[PDB]
Design a protein around this ligand. Sequence first.
Ligand SMILES: CCCCCCCCCCCCC/C=C/[C@H](O)[C@H](N)CO
Lengths: 58, 58, 58, 245, 297, 50
Amino acid sequence: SHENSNSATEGSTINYTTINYYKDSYAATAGKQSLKQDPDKFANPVKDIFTEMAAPLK
Amino acid sequence: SHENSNSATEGSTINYTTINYYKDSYAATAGKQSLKQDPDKFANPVKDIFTEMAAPLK
Amino acid sequence: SHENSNSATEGSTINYTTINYYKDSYAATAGKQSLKQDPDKFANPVKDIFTEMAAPLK
Amino acid sequence: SDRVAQLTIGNSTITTQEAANIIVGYGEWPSYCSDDDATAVDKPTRPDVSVNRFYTLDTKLWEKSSKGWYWKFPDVLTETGVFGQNAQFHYLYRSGFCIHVQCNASKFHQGALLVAILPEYVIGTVAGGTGTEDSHPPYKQTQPGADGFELQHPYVLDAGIPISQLTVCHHQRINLRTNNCATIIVPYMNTLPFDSALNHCNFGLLVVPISPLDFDQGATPVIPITITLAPMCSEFAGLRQAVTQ
Amino acid sequence: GDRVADVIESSIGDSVSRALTQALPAPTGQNTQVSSHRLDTGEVPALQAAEIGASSNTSDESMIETRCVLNSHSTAETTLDSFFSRAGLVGEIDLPLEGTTNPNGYANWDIDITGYAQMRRKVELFTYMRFDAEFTFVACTPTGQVVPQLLQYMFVPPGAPKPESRESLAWQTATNPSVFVKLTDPPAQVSVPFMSPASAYQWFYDGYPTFGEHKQEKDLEYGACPNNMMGTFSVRTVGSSKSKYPLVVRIYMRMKHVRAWIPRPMRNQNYLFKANPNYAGNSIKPTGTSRSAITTL
Amino acid sequence: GDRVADVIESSIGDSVSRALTQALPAPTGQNTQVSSHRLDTGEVPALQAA
Ligand SMILES: CCCCCCCCCCCCC/C=C/[C@H](O)[C@H](N)CO
């Protein structure tokens, strides 16, 4: 399908599989997102990472 | 697609990618124009072209 | 497309390019006729053909 | 190497030492119509050096309270020379142009001019002032001849379009501080390969003083503007008798 | 052959267009290079001559100290197809019941897109255009209501006899393209090709189409270009007797495969007539707005 | 390191003194060369700008 590439995702690490019947890519369906998580961003945002086997403050 | 070639573009340097469901090519969609500009036609229409590093009238 | 061949053209020197969605070929579209002319049939229907450079009756 | 120039074409020659540059209309030189663009089946005649030469039209008077003038092309060249006698006999017509407007002053005068080429400059009238009557311009105002016509409302160019956007077309400026001449080479601009030369005027030349003239008491008070133009790659097709209009 | 020397070494008959410009691909905007301070002599990129006629070629790097910016702004919005392919109202046809405008159930409309001021100002930016079309006919009552009524649109090419009335024998459309719609469906939509004898349309045609002594009676033919008179649009209520529902037809045209030549200034004054660039003589309104002084805002 | 382009291609931190002159050894005074009559155009060694 030869179309324009101007959706609100372009330039990301997530690869879609959508259907589209027009020339512009913001009219396409939502599709199947890739399942990539990152718990280390909001839950463990510390500089030195400590092991769970050790007490942190010694 | 075997059809007639009688659109209002034929014989140009712009190559389209359109869809069409009839035998004549003026009923097709607008499509994706090629992006070719020419600023030297309306902005610098002079015979001898001068460099921007040099004053023109010396 | 496996269909019947029973249109009102079959057995001619003109080759069509039509679309059809039924089993019989008289329901198809009009399509693109071949462009073959014959001016020598109604305009110069004479037995001995004379050149345009020469007067015919001498 | 750039201030001085010379235009030699035909048996005429224009030499100027305070020129700016020779602009080229839309990056296209005037040429002859190819076999793809041609519609007619008769061979077109083409006088080489007898029509491609300069014709000095008329002398205007740039006073203090001037507004502007306009000349419709090629209406100005139907009574001058062999070109004015070929366009009366022939039907089809095809030519570029080369327009050169001289306007001189001393180093104590100040002022500017705008020399514009407006294709299919359609004259519109004021519709009776209030805009009720469906009036139309007369024949002595639409095609004025070689004497031009003074603009009545130059801010709207007597056509409804404003003057401040006129420089999107071909423009050179006669500023009496640096230069004194404006030279424009116009190609053939029409939807048809040939055209009639008695009714359709291709483009209109516009000379309007943007910055006014000024001088002190003691200099000479009259400053003239002269138009000089030469057709280029002229062609004609289709003979008949001489009809004037 | 040729034996003279002023023809074999001549240039008479140059047919190719010797172009000084060459169109380059430009999908995005232009980037900016890194520039440092420069305090040299002779090389000045800020001083030009507006008397030449060409515009400014001053880069941003030759005037200030810039930073490297990888610009990725697409210029795919300002093209001709992305500017004109928006359907605007170009005409309206009335069909009343008891009146003097069209009391016989039919109305004839000449084809011109210069009847409404919002579409007219866009297409008169250029002088020559060359486009296809997609017409759209939305029919409704003057109160917006949709009634079960059958209608026939007919495209009359220039030359064909116009219908004198509703029961006339020109409505039998043996070769004219006609559209039969009701009102309880989506509106009709056709595709009109480039139907001109010339190579492009023209909205401004300076001159007369006829010959002869142009006097005060024949002055209204000025500017009437016959490469644009495309015919007549006709509607009727398909039937014999008098109908009982009033109708209003609206026409919406969008251009596709657009090529345009020779730009020109856009109009700033009010329009007054169709295919006639007249303006108000006393009420000349300036383009911008006025303030008290120039030294202050 | 560096990843921006307006610093890796910049000139901030020029420490060396970019001199236009270069001291030459001169133990004695300068000699004088033989010169003949010269009646040319354009080349003027007597006209300057103070
Ligand atoms: C059922 C058929 C629908 C009617 C289709 C009409 C086709 C006519 C082509 C439309 C293209 C625009 C014509 C432009 C001409 C301008 O009005 C004149 N230059 C100015 O009056």
